[PDB]
Amino acid sequence: ARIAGINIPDHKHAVIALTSIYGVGKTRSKAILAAAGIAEDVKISELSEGQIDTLRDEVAKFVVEGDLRREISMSIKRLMDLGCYRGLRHRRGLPVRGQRTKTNARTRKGPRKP
Amino acid sequence: RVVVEGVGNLMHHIARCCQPIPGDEIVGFITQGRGISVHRADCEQLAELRSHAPERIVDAVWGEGYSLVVRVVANDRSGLLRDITTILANEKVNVLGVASRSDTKQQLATIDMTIEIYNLQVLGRVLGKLNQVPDVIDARRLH
Amino acid sequence: RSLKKGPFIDLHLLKKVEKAVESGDKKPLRTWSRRSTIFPNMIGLTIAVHNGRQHVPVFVTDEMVGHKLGEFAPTRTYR
Amino acid sequence: AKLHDYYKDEVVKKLMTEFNYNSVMQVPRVEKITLNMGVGEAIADKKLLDNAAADLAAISGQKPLITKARKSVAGFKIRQGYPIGCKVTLRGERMWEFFERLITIAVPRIRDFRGLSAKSFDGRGNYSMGVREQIIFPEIDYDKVDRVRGLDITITTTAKSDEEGRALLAAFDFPFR
Amino acid sequence: MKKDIHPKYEEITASCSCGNVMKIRSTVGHDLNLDVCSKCHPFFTGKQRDVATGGRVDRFNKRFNI
RNA sequence: CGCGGGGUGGAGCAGCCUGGUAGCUCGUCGGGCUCAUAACCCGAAGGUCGUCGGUUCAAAUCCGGCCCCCGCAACCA
RNA sequence: UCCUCCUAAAGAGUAACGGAGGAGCACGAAGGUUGGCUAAUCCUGGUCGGACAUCAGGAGGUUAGUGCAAUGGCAUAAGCC
RNA sequence: CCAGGGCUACACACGUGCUACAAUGGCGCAUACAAAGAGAAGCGACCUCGCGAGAGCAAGCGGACCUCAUAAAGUGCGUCGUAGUCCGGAUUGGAGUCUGCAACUCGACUCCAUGAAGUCGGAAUCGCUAGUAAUCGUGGAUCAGAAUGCCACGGUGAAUAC
């Protein structure tokens, strides 16, 4: 009950169980179980290890956790370093996509505290 | 304004470790953001800049020249510096910032005043009226 | 996320670029076409871009490609 | 004791080539592994430190040495004499078994693994690292921790030059980004 | 060593999914099914895949084709 | 000069008494109520504890010096 | 009233409303003995951990400590277990 | 007149809305019942590709005949079992689509991943007595593209008035 160097959930129907893994949403997760041939219903507890390993080999195909984090850290890095507008926004801790900044944008700007 | 090698209008930022004026001409360093980094032509700090990236640098002049810092130096104090006040009025350009440095290690009385200039000529007479006062053992543009 | 078919750039800009390129680096390039994307051939060029009042220079680099010129000419100065 | 045996053979053999030592005693040898664990929260809850003791007991396989605060310091608002951080100085047979148990299985389980700093040396070659999640050790039931007591390890070496240290550690494979 | 105070310590039979079953001493409980033997961990390959990024130009050309 | 007390948020006063973490009122800020202000109602911020040094793990607090302020005495002459 | 130093002129002692500071207790253990151990402080490395927790090594050398003021003394330790 | 910029800035304050905070709920599968519209330098079936938005091909219709266009709540089955939890969906990265010279400032939408605050909201304050309130979904003008806005339609369907 540990894959990708983490994943230790249970009772959850495998797909959700895998959603726990950073780097995988339900879709990709379902896809994994799809190729694995594992029924999504099975609680990870029911899941045989002789199957879990297949799942490890399965998830190996899809970029996850560690590399993913580093990777995103690298793309954002590029941004803030290149000096592209997106980078500026990230350096300013502000919405990038083009959202209203005059009012909301609390997510990026954090709490209304200041 | 500044004819950055055959083109003006180009956004730039004046360096703050040197005080370029319409004289020796100016070396132009291209910063990441804030476009150009005019650092005057020939300067030690400017030197390291070239040292790490010569390719992103081209010259610039003045096309068609204001704001500068100067370090005047006086003898200790006991008031004759007040004499300098009197001179404040005679100085045409409005003083921009008082910065005495009497500290160092001795009884030295230096003052880093910041002002401006309209023409290099006018600057000439500036140094003149600074050199006249006996207590003004020193008076030169700080870099 | 911006024209699947052929990256877009402005013609006069393109020509100004070739003239620069084959002539070898010469002088920073005045440009108003922020819509123009980037080209490997342009890398090195110090093309300057109008920000609404100033044509600010930018040293094109490899990371700087799949981007448009506007992404380097902030118009809204803030504090 | 497997890789200890390994040491006796391939390790010395190996290094003797790269270091042309005049005599066998000149070859560096790991002397003592030291599992330090400064929770410093017993000052709040003493039993918590006991849980830390459980973990070190669960890893070393032996009772941890509970260090006491050396100095009363306001910087942590702790006074001298208070339990502060438990430790273990496992050496010999034990340390080898643990060492294997370390590089073979413990280390690999380390999330987002990326080698190890080659810069972690006292100059004497006595290497030092610091796991953040004690759970990577099999003995911990994972679920049973109420905390993520990370700890740190000091591989003391008889090596003098830290470089000799690297070499010695290199004989036992080891990460090193 | 001092008797009793130390937790029981015996040679459990560890086993990675990778097949490098190995018997080593510890306490654990009985033993353990693992996933990665240091030999079967991707450092000697993993770090390699890790750097893989850079050179926008090629990607741009993929978009080019004209 | 001598003696005793004091100095804490913007202002007035606690807590220093016995070392660890500073409280109240008014005021300040934001919102509400009102046509508007006030009062009122809700929320929140706000004090390097005069200064310097020393003692202590730790000083608003303990000690000494200093500045400032108040009170007392400054008599037989 | 008592304790430490200087004054005090290298024995002792030696005054001033002379210069500097403490005591009016503490502990059954902080005592007795046996055995064992030895600091402070910096640098280097190291999960949380930072100027400062714990660990390791080095430098270092008693600059530490010695229930309390100072003086003398202490590793054979009188210091610590 | 022009290009580019700006009307989208961001310590903050307020108004008005949409979405949630869940179990009369979410999710998957199957499945029932609308009215009102709009359409040609438009609507664009079917068919083919794509995970998708769409792309290619392409009839019918400027219209009770064609298209937009399977309404959704609901119903049946299953699952989740009270967790910040399969709630929630912001934010961001990467990868795309379409409009339009052109999407950087600054478009909408799609996929992958991510998955924040929030667990029913202080003082205070609003709407509503019937097919109303509430709740669900559909359409249109505007419009190249671009709404949670607005105007409009229908389904479900109350409470309470001493």
PDB file of C-alpha atoms (C1' of nucleotides) in Angstrom, chain D residues 32 34 36 38-39 67 70 75-76 78 84-85 87 120-121 124 128-130 150 154, chain G residues 39-41 44-59 64-65:
ATOM      1  CA  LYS D  32      30.282   4.522  14.834  1.00  0.00           C
ATOM      2  CA  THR D  34      24.975   7.853  15.788  1.00  0.00           C
ATOM      3  CA  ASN D  36      20.506  11.725  16.960  1.00  0.00           C
ATOM      4  CA  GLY D  38      16.324  16.330  19.091  1.00  0.00           C
ATOM      5  CA  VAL D  39      12.575  16.580  19.531  1.00  0.00           C
ATOM      6  CA  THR D  67      20.365  13.465  26.358  1.00  0.00           C
ATOM      7  CA  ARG D  70      23.535  21.124  28.528  1.00  0.00           C
ATOM      8  CA  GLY D  75      16.344  31.033  23.046  1.00  0.00           C
ATOM      9  CA  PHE D  76      14.212  27.922  23.487  1.00  0.00           C
ATOM     10  CA  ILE D  78      14.659  25.541  28.232  1.00  0.00           C
ATOM     11  CA  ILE D  84      15.988  17.495  25.232  1.00  0.00           C
ATOM     12  CA  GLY D  85      16.804  14.919  22.567  1.00  0.00           C
ATOM     13  CA  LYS D  87      20.165   9.456  20.747  1.00  0.00           C
ATOM     14  CA  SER D 120      28.201  17.048   4.093  1.00  0.00           C
ATOM     15  CA  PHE D 121      31.535  16.471   5.853  1.00  0.00           C
ATOM     16  CA  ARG D 124      37.404  14.509   8.914  1.00  0.00           C
ATOM     17  CA  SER D 128      26.075  13.439   8.364  1.00  0.00           C
ATOM     18  CA  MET D 129      22.526  13.380   6.970  1.00  0.00           C
ATOM     19  CA  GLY D 130      19.030  13.865   8.334  1.00  0.00           C
ATOM     20  CA  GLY D 150      12.572  13.170  11.438  1.00  0.00           C
ATOM     21  CA  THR D 154      26.262  10.763  11.923  1.00  0.00           C
TER      22      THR D 154
ATOM     23  C1'   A G  39      35.221  22.046  31.185  1.00  0.00           C
ATOM     24  C1'   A G  40      34.187  27.415  28.504  1.00  0.00           C
ATOM     25  C1'   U G  41      34.099  28.991  23.739  1.00  0.00           C
ATOM     26  C1'   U G  44      32.950  22.383  10.344  1.00  0.00           C
ATOM     27  C1'   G G  45      28.982  18.978   9.293  1.00  0.00           C
ATOM     28  C1'   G G  46      24.009  17.704  10.365  1.00  0.00           C
ATOM     29  C1'   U G  47      15.587  16.708  10.037  1.00  0.00           C
ATOM     30  C1'   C G  48      12.455  20.132  12.225  1.00  0.00           C
ATOM     31  C1'   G G  49      16.534  24.037  14.176  1.00  0.00           C
ATOM     32  C1'   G G  50      17.032  29.835  13.764  1.00  0.00           C
ATOM     33  C1'   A G  51      22.411  33.936  17.092  1.00  0.00           C
ATOM     34  C1'   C G  52      21.408  29.971  20.849  1.00  0.00           C
ATOM     35  C1'   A G  53      18.289  23.159  21.929  1.00  0.00           C
ATOM     36  C1'   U G  54      20.305  17.557  20.801  1.00  0.00           C
ATOM     37  C1'   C G  55      24.403  14.674  17.660  1.00  0.00           C
ATOM     38  C1'   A G  56      29.503  14.329  15.380  1.00  0.00           C
ATOM     39  C1'   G G  57      34.364  15.962  14.716  1.00  0.00           C
ATOM     40  C1'   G G  58      38.008  19.507  15.211  1.00  0.00           C
ATOM     41  C1'   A G  59      40.330  23.685  17.620  1.00  0.00           C
ATOM     42  C1'   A G  64      34.377  26.315  32.990  1.00  0.00           C
ATOM     43  C1'   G G  65      32.716  25.028  37.299  1.00  0.00           C
TER      44        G G  65
END
